[PDB]
Design a protein around this ligand. Structure first.
Ligand SMILES: [Cl-]
Ligand SMILES: [Cl-]
Ligand SMILES: [Cl-]
Ligand SMILES: [Cl-]
Ligand SMILES: [Cl-]
Ligand SMILES: [Cl-]
Ligand SMILES: [Mg+2]
Ligand SMILES: [Mg+2]
Lengths: 390, 390
């Protein structure tokens, strides 16, 4: 058996939604197919992957460096010790051959996208959902019954006012989510507080509301927002300052004693480790948001999780950015704290399996092989169409 | 006046040379032309740029994200206050619009390459060498008369032995360089020590030799090499450990009191700042090697230089990676410590102006408009050919 070919294509997820840092008018993502010669249920096993919103597609990197490099390897060199499934670890090593250290951006997305497809294929060859594969290999067969999820939206948009924002959040609550997340930092403080007030009329307690500044604030603005946010008792205050300005987050923690979250824009275990060492994150109350699809994949994510354990952090503090089924499987299989979900934005690259409802903030995973792409009609149609695998 | 078009192409700089981390068998770089409608000396002013070795080309990024952004901007919005030259700062802002923070790799190379071409064009429109434009605008008209340069090579290569390494270093010294740099960490310690011994027979004092581990060592290996290197009194010990593992460098500095150098693989002012805060680098003796062509260009490099001043570091501690004329101009115009040079590797993307000799480790800059590409016959022929401007 072998990987026969790897295909890539670029998809559009463009719209005029905006956070404090960017708008999404040009936003794209990569989709990948890892085609094998293994037969399951009368058809070839093909693994699929895509990268999360916000970083754009990485098709250039995929086609110029990573796909050729992986496809020039001897095919047996990519197999596990049984000879009857792929080895994501050998594949990762091949992908990263002749890559210099540092510079963890863009190529991190290319590798993350291939890694997703590789794990999808491995689980399909094994005949199990990915969470089951991961629980069996890494957690002694113990998987979570379900995963904590929150609904992320609350973007700025032309003409969107507090009534529309309330309607949005009510629609998330009606779909089973308890906790929601909104953007802040893209309007004057008083206007953001009025937006927060409006959402709380819908969701009740601050316990049910997260806010995300998308890394836009300098220290003075981060502290000023913090002081204004304190009375609301929000579930978390996310990415106040630049994702790499570790000293800024450490100073902010001296002034804001309620939970904070960051890390979606750190794309390696090295960068994650620097956050842990230098960022003043607090293991009993803060949250880490690393996204494997943007960060060289699950093979790299396991190094990050090992580093967290060695530095006194629980995996239960990790709630990945990105809203994807790959993270959902990792959460239940490796015991993360939960997963972000997008009920509205970035269609069709959002949501989990069709027909499996979120119930008071928790969702179960389908007993279907792989990551679960085939259980999302619209997304699967879009991906197989783009990649020519119908 | 305006930018009429921006062109890009990929060049090969492939060979089987190797350092401790990678070999260069698939190495590429981007070349860019920024075509204006300004006439100087009877022809269109065209600015040129290329990115340094080691990070590969970024053609996909250039074509899919960055060039379309500039080319969709209102032409007047890219000009400076006078209306008769380009504004690299407005251009940089346009290039980075809708880019999320963190993730400083690959896109840093795309932007660095366009920025080089932009400054080349600006200096040509002003009619002066770039170092003169920079000295006048940023240093009250004071430029260095010349720049300190060292010869970087000493790569591993199949069949290459100590005799060939000696011949190499002799040829650098014969071309006017006093100090040379070689690679270490790609062979057992004893074999590297024999290589170092062989080179010192050519260059004499350790004062004339740098060694570069290309980020390959864990802390134990970094310390062990340090202990073995101490008796030689080397000019610097470069990039012992992972470029992002700041705590490792800080620990190493407790064990190795002689000069060390790092930073070529940090591609933003944020990442540079983290090295300065957390890496235990010593402003009195250590060296910083940030490369603008890989790091979103000179506009971003100015932010890094401002950060260094605020943090008690002199610009004289900065000696850029990459061997290019862009850095040569920055060095003289903004008062850096020197520039890396490549007399053998990465042809034709190496060396400075034809016909201007290095003399005991110092080189002057030509009084010619722009960065100086046209003064390098082979490089300019190659670039103009690739970009369709010949
Ligand atoms: Cl935001
Ligand atoms: Cl982040
Ligand atoms: Cl919830
Ligand atoms: Cl090396
Ligand atoms: Cl390169
Ligand atoms: Cl020299
Ligand atoms: Mg976020
Ligand atoms: Mg180096």
């Amino acid at each position: 058996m072998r990987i026969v070919e790897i295909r890539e294509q670029t998809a559009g997820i463009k719209s005029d939604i905006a956070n404090a840092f960017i708008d999404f008018s040009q936003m794209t993502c990569s989709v990948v197919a890892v085609v094998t010669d293994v037969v399951r249920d009368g058809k070839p096993v093909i693994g699929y992957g895509f990268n999360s919103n916000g970083r754009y597609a990485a098709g250039g990197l995929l086609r110029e460096r990573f796909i050729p490099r992986l496809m020039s390897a001897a095919p047996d060199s990519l197999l596990d010790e049984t000879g009857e499934n792929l080895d994501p670890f050998r594949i990762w090593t091949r992908l990263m051959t002749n890559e210099k250290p540092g510079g963890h951006g863009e190529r991190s997305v290319a590798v993350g996208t291939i890694d997703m497809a590789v794990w999808d294929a491995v689980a399909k060859i094994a005949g199990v959902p990915l969470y089951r594969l991961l629980a069996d290999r890494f957690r002694g067969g113990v998987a979570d019954d379900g995963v904590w999820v929150y609904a992320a939206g609350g973007y700025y948009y032309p003409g969107k006012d507090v009534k529309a924002l309330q309607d949005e959040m009510r629609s998330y609550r009606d779909r089973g989510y308890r906790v929601v997340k909104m953007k802040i930092g893209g309007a004057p403080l008083a206007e953001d507080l009025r937006r927060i007030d409006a959402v709380l009329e819908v969701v009740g307690s601050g316990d049910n509301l997260c806010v995300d500044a998308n890394g836009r604030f300098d220290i003075d603005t981060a502290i000023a927002y913090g002081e204004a946010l304190k009375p609301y008792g929000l579930f978390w205050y996310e990415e106040a300052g630049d994702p790499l300005d570790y000293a800024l987050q450490a100073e902010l923690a001296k002034h804001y004693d309620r939970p904070m979250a960051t890390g979606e824009n750190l794309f390696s275990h090295q960068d994650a480790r620097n956050l842990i060492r230098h960022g003043g994150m607090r293991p009993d109350r803060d949250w880490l948001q690393f996204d494997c699809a943007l960060s060289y994949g699950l093979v790299e994510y396991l190094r990050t999780l090992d580093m967290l354990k060695e530095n006194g952090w629980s995996s239960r503090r990790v709630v990945p950015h990105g809203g994807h089924q790959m993270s959902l499987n990792i959460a239940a299989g490796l015991h993360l704290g939960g997963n972000e979900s997008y009920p509205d934005v970035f269609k069709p690259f959002c949501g989990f399996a069709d027909g499996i409802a979120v119930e008071d903030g928790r969702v179960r995973l389908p007993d279907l092989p792989g990551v679960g792409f085939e259980a999302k009609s619209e997304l699967f149609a879009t991906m197989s169409g783009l990649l020519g695998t119908r």
